[PDB]
Amino acid sequence: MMYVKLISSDGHEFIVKREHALTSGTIKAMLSGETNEVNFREIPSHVLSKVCMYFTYKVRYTNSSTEIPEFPIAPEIALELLMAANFLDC
Amino acid sequence: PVLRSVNSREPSQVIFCNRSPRVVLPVWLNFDGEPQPYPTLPPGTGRRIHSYRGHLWLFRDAGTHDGLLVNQTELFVPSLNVDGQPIFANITLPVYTLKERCLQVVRSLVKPENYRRLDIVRSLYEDLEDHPNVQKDLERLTQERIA
Amino acid sequence: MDVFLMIRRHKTTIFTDAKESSTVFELKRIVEGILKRPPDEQRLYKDDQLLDDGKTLGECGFTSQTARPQAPATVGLAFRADDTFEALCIEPFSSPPELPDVMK
Numbered sequence: 001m002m003y004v005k006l007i008s009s010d011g012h013e014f015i016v017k018r019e020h021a022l023t024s025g026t027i028k029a030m031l032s033g034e035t036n037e038v039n040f041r042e043i044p045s046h047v048l049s050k051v052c053m054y055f056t057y058k059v060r061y062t063n064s065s066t067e068i069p070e071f072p073i074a075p076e077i078a079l080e081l082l083m084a085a086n087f088l089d090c
Numbered sequence: 091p092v093l094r095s096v097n098s099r100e101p102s103q104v105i106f107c108n109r110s111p112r113v114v115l116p117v118w119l120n121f122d123g124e125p126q127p128y129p130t131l132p133p134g135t136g137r138r139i140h141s142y143r144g145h146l147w148l149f150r151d152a153g154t155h156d157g158l159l160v161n162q163t164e165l166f167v168p169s170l171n172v173d174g175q176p177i178f179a180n181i182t183l184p185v186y187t188l189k190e191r192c193l194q195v196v197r198s199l200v201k202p203e204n205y206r207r208l209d210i211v212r213s214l215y216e217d218l219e220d221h222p223n224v225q226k227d228l229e230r231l232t233q234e235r236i237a
Numbered sequence: 238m239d240v241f242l243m244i245r246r247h248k249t250t251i252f253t254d255a256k257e258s259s260t261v262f263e264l265k266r267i268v269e270g271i272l273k274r275p276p277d278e279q280r281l282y283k284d285d286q287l288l289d290d291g292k293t294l295g296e297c298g299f300t301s302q303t304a305r306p307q308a309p310a311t312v313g314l315a316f317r318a319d320d321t322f323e324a325l326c327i328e329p330f331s332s333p334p335e336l337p338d339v340m341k
């Protein structure tokens with residue numbers, strides 16, 4: 001499908017399907033007032049990587065009667081991930 | 091209260107199946123609408139129990155009070171048994187928002203007093219504080235029904 | 238049986254879903270559209286071993302349980318430019334801070 005690129009502070013590039021990224025209203029807006037790229041100056045890769053995994057998880061298991069697994073969040077990343085979440089509104 | 095059980099006095103048999111990784115606390119709304127606790131179901135367990143038609147159930151994490159879904163909705167009302175078959179109420183994890191899930195993990199690791207010590211924006215303290223509860227979800231469901 | 242995976246090379250990472258009945262070549266084609274490099278120039282690896290074109294994803298070991306949406310499996314990528322295929326180099330993600338004391 002259509003893909004978009006989400007870049008972290010440490011310079012890692014993540015290519016995610018647009019519809020997966022549009023899970024975040026903040027990413028949506030950034031995408032539209034062209035480049036399909038977005039730069040997150042304050043989100044490091046070990047957070048943004050986990051954000052992309054959430055995008056995959058929500059899409060698959062949203063509106064599905066399969067037993068939903070627990071989204072795994074380790075303790076060492078939880079506080080940073082929460083911060084990213086509040087900003088991304090996902 | 092619109093969200094209240096009704097005294098059918100008509101017995102129904104249900105199987106509560108926990109299809110979550112969480113310890114479930116079954117919650118029964120009495121005829122005056124008050125939430126009432128019931129025996130907990132550990133993960134991977136199910137039980138055949140007795141209830142009556144028109145009685146309202148909701149299902150929650152026993153320790154954290156996080157919201158859980160019963161048959162892919164929030165409320166379970168036992169139907170009339172058919173052919174001797176128990177009605178199945180399957181408790182599943184919802185697809186939480188990333189923020190809510192992140193809050194669940196932090197709350198799990200940080201004592202409520204120390205929430206203010208975290209180096210996070212203030213709006214998020216208040217969020218960590220607003221622990222999930224049954225009283226708040228009942229008002230939402232009522233208004234949704236009104237809609 | 239959809240499998241969910243991460244395709245990584247250097248500092249790039251791709252998040253895509255594929256069927257267990259699909260192959261390396263079909264996945265190399267997926268890389269094409271996204272990254273504009275032809276299949277002849279892509280080597281896809283599971284761990285340190287090359288995955289042979291025409292081996293189904295499950296055969297390669299990308300089992301449905303092993304590659305899950307919450308915890309995707311990594312399929313390595315290296316590009317063949319000019320003379321030699323490059324060595325596999327997947328840069329690590331940032332290291333997390335030390336857990337704060339309150340959490341500790």
Ligand SMILES: Cc1ncsc1-c1ccc(CNC(=O)[C@@H]2C[C@@H](O)CN2C(=O)[C@@H](NC(=O)C2(F)CC2)C(C)(C)SC[C@H]2CC[C@H](CN3CCOCC3)CC2)cc1
Binds near residue numbers: 098116129137
């Ligand atoms: C094992 C397990 N694991 C997770 S949950 C669970 C579990 C466990 C027990 C159940 C019993 N079931 C109900 O309590 C259903 C449910 C709800 O529908 C209300 N309710 C009613 O019984 C209401 N009464 C009435 O509606 C009427 F009289 C009009 C018909 C009522 C709440 C007003 S009386 C409840 C009494 C409780 C005591 C019992 C007698 N003993 C045996 C149990 O303890 C000791 C003494 C007789 C009934 C169900 C599930």
